[model samples]
Target chain A: PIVQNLQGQMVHQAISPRTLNAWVKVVEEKAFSPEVIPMFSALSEGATPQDLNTMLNTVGGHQAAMQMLKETINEEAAEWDRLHPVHAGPIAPGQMREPRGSDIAGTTSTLQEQIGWMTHNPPIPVGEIYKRWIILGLNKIVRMYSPTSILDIRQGPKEPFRDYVDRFSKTLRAEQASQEVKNWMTETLLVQNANPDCKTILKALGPGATLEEMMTACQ
Target chain B: PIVQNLQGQMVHQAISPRTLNAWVKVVEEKAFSPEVIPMFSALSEGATPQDLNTMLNTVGGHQAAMQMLKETINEEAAEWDRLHPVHAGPIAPGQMREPRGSDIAGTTSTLQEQIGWMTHNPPIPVGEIYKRWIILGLNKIVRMYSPTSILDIRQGPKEPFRDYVDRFSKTLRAEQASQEVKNWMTETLLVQNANPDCKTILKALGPGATLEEMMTACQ
Candidate 1:
């Protein structure tokens, strides 16, 4: 079952019982007073109990661990935002760039290194830690590869229409731009310098205009 | 440049010049009173003037168009939330189920149909409308294809380890799970129910345990 907060957003699962007991043990061993509870609360926002255990063991204290978690989410979210801004309109012409898989892989590796540095004797298994990275990073990854992000592709003002068309075709292949997208593209491009003849051609092409048809007419 | 709100989230671009003037024309034709301006303001939050034009042309009045626009964003946002819930933790075992491309295509088609019905003589060019659908729906598509969503794959409780390993390998390929994921799977599956002999064999296999190595040891 999905775990979600009051806002109905899916959230981290509650700490498992195995991890809670370990947490209690850590508290006893550290001989920490109740002051650590607030820090614990801050760190626990969306973390599993096992995550609590890992933080305790790796960061050497409750205070440092709590700060680490805060920084982790914030830093990750910021980097993600920087790389992938939300789309407000069609991407300007010639702006269709896809995120490479290697970049995502590199980020995943860097996250692992960060976790490794933060936690010693981490109770979270390597598998679980990798999973956590994926969970935290998935949204950013998805935004980067979204098909709609490529809609901003325009024929470069100085570039040949044929070259632009080929480039657009490549994007369509990768993103699998739908029939609606294709229809829209054909209309938008064709209408840019629409003379009476062009409009006549488009009218004949109708609502089901294809890129090839528009390209031939434009040429 | 992308149009984002004060909070930095992407917002609908202001109505394009072509659309805003068109909207004014619609308002004039409808003979809207001053009281309707507030409703207009509300509908304009993240909309282009073209959006209003589409609403009016399709739904028959400024009042109804405003209502339709309000409902459209809300319904779209809600459906997006339903499909792409925020993740706070790794999905649990047996919870990994990547959404199929068919599901995304189905949703995309549905959105196109919905928009088509609402925006007769839509002020937005067909190209821009297609882009808008992608912008609004990209997050959902991304979530359906996220790598983290695949981590919950597991062998059935009653399934044989050999069969499970083969199944897991296939998922790794489809999701393009990282080397780290493969390594973690190797370690985690190797440790499960391992007797002393199995542990020794795994240890001999060392940090780079392959599926074949583990399989041979288990056998």
Candidate 2:
């Protein structure tokens, strides 16, 4: 931040210890920077923009602040885990790490795209690690996966028939297609792409079958 | 900056025409941004960090603004060239394109670093191209190539002795190296490394010489 460091309010909110440590870190990532908006503040009047860019090894400015934000996520990661642990045991399958700060930092997308992914996918939850840098303020993110996504389904190689069917069926309401349209697309996928023993069974009885109808018709 | 766009007071300052076009662009690249300090003012309350990030395809926020900064340099590029043309004929030889905004944006470095490279080398003068984004106000870059650099000089591979010597002699005052000390190290480099036919001429007469003295000995 332009000010060297931020002060902690010590009434009911101060001395929050580990939790405040986590909370204050929230400000550090969200508000601190020499080249960016720390909720305020450049190079002039005897100042050089060069030195600021050198600090983060960036150009024209701004991104250096993001690099600093990244450092914050790294520095206090352990404390964030202790103070606000991710225990989505019942909510997540072990297939992925359930999105975390690493997920946020891992990609090279610009900030807006990264958040868009979070909006459509599961949000990483507030007070979690990446959330340290992710401050939601006056500006709001309104995002949606387009309903056109329903037409793009293709069965995966070596994938389970049920898994493919579930994925295929999941978009039924998303695209808001007619039931007949859905049934036609379902039969079309089997005829054009399917070759499994189960694939033929759905194909065998599939001329007028609906999405759910063909789903059970096969497996 | 907090205000959507800045106004150019069209006085003796405003329609200097092309120069003003160049001057106002100075503010555009330096001042405008959706995330950074355009010289003030985040996310919170009704807003979502996810959306800001989605815009720039970044996480957290801030950097989407820099991507915008890069765009300004890109968008009005032709007009910038028309307004403030680079005519460094007497000042430079055609080795490199002399630093331009593209050079600043070309790297993945942070802003400070991009400026640092400009500082050590020739600065890309104001109103050239990248100067639209590179504003020097209260913050000035006070940079120097360190004095300890004298000990690290080495000849380039298959490089001309004259070219190497020119580089070698150029650093005399840069690192504040002593005249004799410069000569001793000079002879040492040739002996330990040089294999050219001319190398022994300098090596044969070497033990005592100044940096300038060693120059005459070689050529």
Candidate 3:
């Protein structure tokens, strides 16, 4: 098939495959400014003439481009978290502590550094580096293991009604539970509320009730 | 007379005359930080307790204090301009060029340098130095010459009727003309318009007519 790129443009009209392949080869072989790599990546991905012009104006020379690259790395880390089960061991009883702002910032910077290291490849076209490290591989991993998420919500034995509802709902959504699973989970959680009044309300919500209806009936 | 110091506190109550004299002698003989001259000057001028408290909060130990001193110097120069006629020379015919932003900034820096040099005195208390160089001297000059300003209204031969009125009114106000003089000038300007209908209207206004009456008649 003829190469059609993300922006719905034919790649060969403005740039020949030979020319693009040659440019990518030169980037791999030579010392190009690390600053302009993002723009170069966009071009290799078949950025239209108009898109290239807009990108040139948007990026500040050197300092601004470098700053943007750093920001992109951090954003990639955040997107990674969204797609992957990377959370470490949860706190044991009485072990919880409020995370300081500075600590969170330090963690984010560390993740950004890791992402940058994992994605960088001098021999690869920069666009393909992003696709491999971030888009394609990360997406495949997300699809492969997300269905068997470990975050199944079990109503705690003595947990307060609202507290249990909140935690259970959070775990269900974060684990990417389907609508059908969520409806069943919400009814199960509502019934788990041990308060007699709460159990009566859950019964009134009926078997086919949605998460929203179950939450309201519990309240 | 009892000396009420800048903090508006009785100087005698805090120290003996002999001790105060000795302290003054020591200040005169010793080196002092030039940075805090403005604060001392304000204190010497009988600055109230509240004023001293405010000043204490504002001054940065070195950097902030130094920055304020620079700002004060420029501010003093601006105050001088308001009270003194330091206009160098008027532009010659066809020689007038609009001053560029850089040129104006250069002149302001030059003035700041001049004020800084004129105010610095190691033997004097820093606050006293500012009071003497800026506050006391500026106010004295302002008081000495402000009563009789040089602005005077005169009709130029080739000046248009409205132009003459505007210029004459502006000069009169600048020179602090009395209400009586303004009223007479307004009537005179209205008559000077020289449209036959205008002159007839002015004639209908009696000699004792106020400015408002003259304007109404002219209209």
Candidate 4:
């Protein structure tokens, strides 16, 4: 169910190479802008709370990032096939294309909600786990579905079906739920570490302190 | 040089679309582990903090997002062209794609430093100005070296270079930046007003007081 909702939709429209170039151009522009630039930059910087929100596009809902990513995905549809040489040749007219606005919006919402939920209940064993999850979740969804997915569930020991459903669902036992928490914690610590005024908290708590303590100390 | 660096090489590899999909999958797996899942639930419940570094991933840097985006661009390339229907055809082989890893890493570092510098420096009038100049400088660079970029520049100003540059840069300053700030103020204030912790800060500084002042008052 989570994957079902999380996956990007196939747009009927096909793309040519040139348009893909343009789409990339547009996204790069927004990605670098003060409002939006801060988001990606924050991720790159490791998520410190920039003093100014103008500078702080640093803290965004995953939903926002999803929207941005999805937007970028649809924008670059023209060149998708070439990039995926594995799928070499023209995609059928009805083939699922890259993310559309609705798809991105949906995915973003799902991701943001996941993040949002994590912060509420708190999940994950460590930041490393969270980091692993971000890429993990992204990769898994890609794999299970289209030209990208390599995982053969049919060949392997079947993981719990109900568990998978619960994971993407609200059930607390699922990794999706916990991974969001870990990501949030990582982002906060990163932000505090990057900030001059905020950096002191880490020193006070020591490097090993949980993000919870760091946030309180910083606040 | 900043604009120069940004224009050509923000992403390093011709990341495989499949790789990006894999990356997403990876995130999903790690995020939802039962151990981590509770943390995510807490976050949704409005926990916000507990153990930042202990929970989230930070060390990976821009590599993850970049890889995903690069592949996404390639995957959606054709869709992109079909939708826009502009120049048409593949980007000339002679044309470069993606920023080198070092370039991406370097830009990622420089961008964070600059954001930190801006945040610490405050009164972002210069930063606002700088943002505009950077965009213009980038537009110029993209026009000459890249093919698709030339089209972007054409769509960007459609006026004298100086006029375009000045007006384009000032647009954010003139209105956009102010509006954005206004939005953040409302959001932050709402958080403060709703948060029991900040009630004292609100009463002491009035609803619209500076965050620093409110922070001080809160303590």
Candidate 5:
């Protein structure tokens, strides 16, 4: 099944707990800085008043509450950043202005289709690291909190997924932490597809297969 | 410019007040019902604390917020229905799936490049009717809700957008709405390479157009 592919494809290696601790501290320290506002402004741009009104009305229609929401939600940042640490990079726009299927680097029909699209491309290797870093970063500043730090379930820095390097630390205990990262990878990362064929494949596994077999199942 | 084309496209017509109202009502009415969950005794599905923990953690995890979020954000069904009048239909494994182009009478294009691609088709009698319905319907709906409908603009659906459509009576409005519907398109709707170039020469005048134009541009 698609789930098994994720489990098998991910290589587990030992990592230092110290690395995890250090990054969390850095994120926390930077969280409250003024750099976060731009992120929120960008995400909230083009939002219709109706959608805003809908959210506002549901939450009592106070502009303050709406504004405060950016902060209240930021309180959860440190925890988020720790586990979902993304590699930092510049953001590129829809500027790949090339026509469809022409010289596109990563695609199902291309080289890195095995893992999801976001994991192995410009956004990962070139652009911003954490998918929500901009928003999370902004949340931290507005909410007057620390940045989020995600748990490291993977053993060490695996190749190719260069941006997720920070996430491959040793803070997670296999029994408790493995599940945490597993949940991040499986439920969060895997299901983002419009119709996740990868997940569908993983779920079809009948079980009782060796770890190697699950990995090979994708073949 | 892109903005000009959006003003003269059918998809934009989809956002008309009447259409928006209908769509909003759809959301207000639909309820999500999850079909499956792991059971303890009757149907264990081999669910373990570890499994549940991971699932919950992934959902609640800081990095996983976007993924674990439910389509129906409202915990209370009744209250949610009251606030959101439009339903996009069906909570798929991923984003709200039901606005499937095929499901509607609209043509389908998988790639974003194809949005509003069909606006170039030769003028058909059916196309004319679609246009009139769009303008009139939009005017009526905008008029119904304080002439603005929470668009956040003090002037509301100001100027030509409101005044233009109010000129037509109900039957004429519906007829013209259908005829002109294809004209008020948006690039956001185009998605595939095969889709038509909506801003090309066969198009007609859209909202706020001082005079009818054959192609989309800065009029």
Candidate 6:
């Protein structure tokens, strides 16, 4: 499952539709409490606009809300093949083909029907499609680091150690390489990716450490 | 120059590098000004660690700041050849290459030297490379939309119509097509891309207008 905050509009545009649809699926399947959805859309926005923080506060803290979202509904197919050619070469613009093996597990999912229901008037409203997809997506999109490449989340410059701890933990908790590799990544990447200021802060917190030790100091 | 408030992190990471270097070129060659650079990376970010808005407020407001970026520096080659192959097939991974003519005026720019400079570091510091690229990028990135495809920027959901108006005008003021085509895109896309509620608000503003009329009404 993806384990980062949603980061870009295009990424949101790409990742969300699937996750939003999966969110719809989870909703239909009754996987989460219903109130979660409306709390988000309720009028917010401030001097700027209902900013991401304001919206997150509507539900709860950022990490908490993010966790609820993924724990509730994780869309493995959230990434678009064209935008992110993770396991395979990017989808060519309809060029002559090469037989590749990863092509075996088709990147198939609900597309025609998703489009089908809305396209046919005997189906549903476009706004319904928009809202379910939109609000649901924006809530997630405006909030966190997307599971970009689902790579170990990197700390943004000046992003607090605590925040990075949380962000890093999100991925650390969910996925792994090996214990040795994990410790090394948790140790190395956490410091390497942080803003120098954070490195200073971390150094003061203590020298060598794993996620657990650093997390403790951070909190 | 592309317009619109750059909306996300991924978008930032995508757009800025090319523009940054263009900015670099513009700088070394004595473009507009120098003060614009430092105003950004100056130890900002608080309550949430150098939030985009905070970072932008560092130099100026979002739109004005954004305009400075595009007007002062526009990189036709900015969009990554792979990430946004606007005119060509999305570069495939070692697939049978095909014949296409948008291939003209190759998406060429300084790369080897860009890499060469640091790699041989008979040149400069990685941190120097990092700062220019990172800070320069995060500035524009956190500030506005990537030429986002240099596509006419779309208004985000719930984004204010006036803001949309400003945003739309940016694109409207930019690279365009035939007069009729321009008017049609400016008029049609503005209302269509906006939130439905914006549509309602626009309706009361009176209808059947072009970019100029809408801009006037918007202001």
lDDT of 2 by residue, B69-151 (tens): 44555554545556557574654443334434444434433433333333323434322233334222101111211243555
In candidate 2, how many Å is residue A82 off?
43
Q: Name the DockQ score for candidate 1.
A: 0.01
The TM-score leader among the candidates is 2
lDDT (tens digit, per residue) of candidate 4 on A87-198? 2322445433332222222322233332222233322111122222222222222222112221111111222222222222222222233577645644453434234544
lDDT of model 3 at residue B186? 58
- List residue ranges in candidate 5 displaced over 4 A: A1-19, A26-219, B1-132, B144-219
Q: Encode model 6's per-residue lDDT on B1-219: one tens digit a residue.
A: 111233521111122333334444433442223444554344221111122222333334345544544332233224323444546554355322322112211112122322222333143322242234334544554344333221556666656567777767767755435578667776567777766655666667756655465545533
Can you write out model 3's per-residue Cα lDDT over B116-157, one digit (the tens) per residue?
Answer: 222333211222333444343323323333333323444344
**Scoring only the second chain, what is candidate 6's TM-score?**
0.29
Q: Judged by DockQ cut-offs, is candidate 6 incorrect, acceptable, medium or high?
A: incorrect
lDDT (10s digit) by residue, model 2, range A1-219: 010111311111112133223223323433332212222111111111221222223221334335544455464444444555555552445333443434444332233333233332354422222332432210111121234556544443234466666666676656653678777775566444343454566667645666566656555
In angstroms, the error of model 6 at A146 is 12
For candidate 6, write residues A77-119 as lDDT tens digits: 1222222334346577343332211221111213333333334
- State chain A's TM-score for model 1: 0.26
How many angstroms is residue B89 displaced in model 6 relative to the true structure, after the best TM-score fit?
70
Q: Chain B TM-score of all predictions, in order?
A: 0.29, 0.29, 0.30, 0.21, 0.15, 0.29
Candidate 5 chain A lowest-lDDT run of ten: A99-108
Model 6 TM-score relative to the real fold: 0.21
**What does DockQ come to for candidate 3?**
0.00
Q: Model 3's chain B TM-score?
A: 0.30
Please write out the lDDT profile of model 1 over residues B101-129, one tens digit for every residue. Answer: 22222222222222332233432223233
lDDT of 5 at A164: 26
Which ranking of candidates, highest TM-score first? 2, 3, 6, 1, 5, 4
Better of 3 and 4 by TM-score: 3
Q: Share of real contacts kept by model 5?
A: 0.00
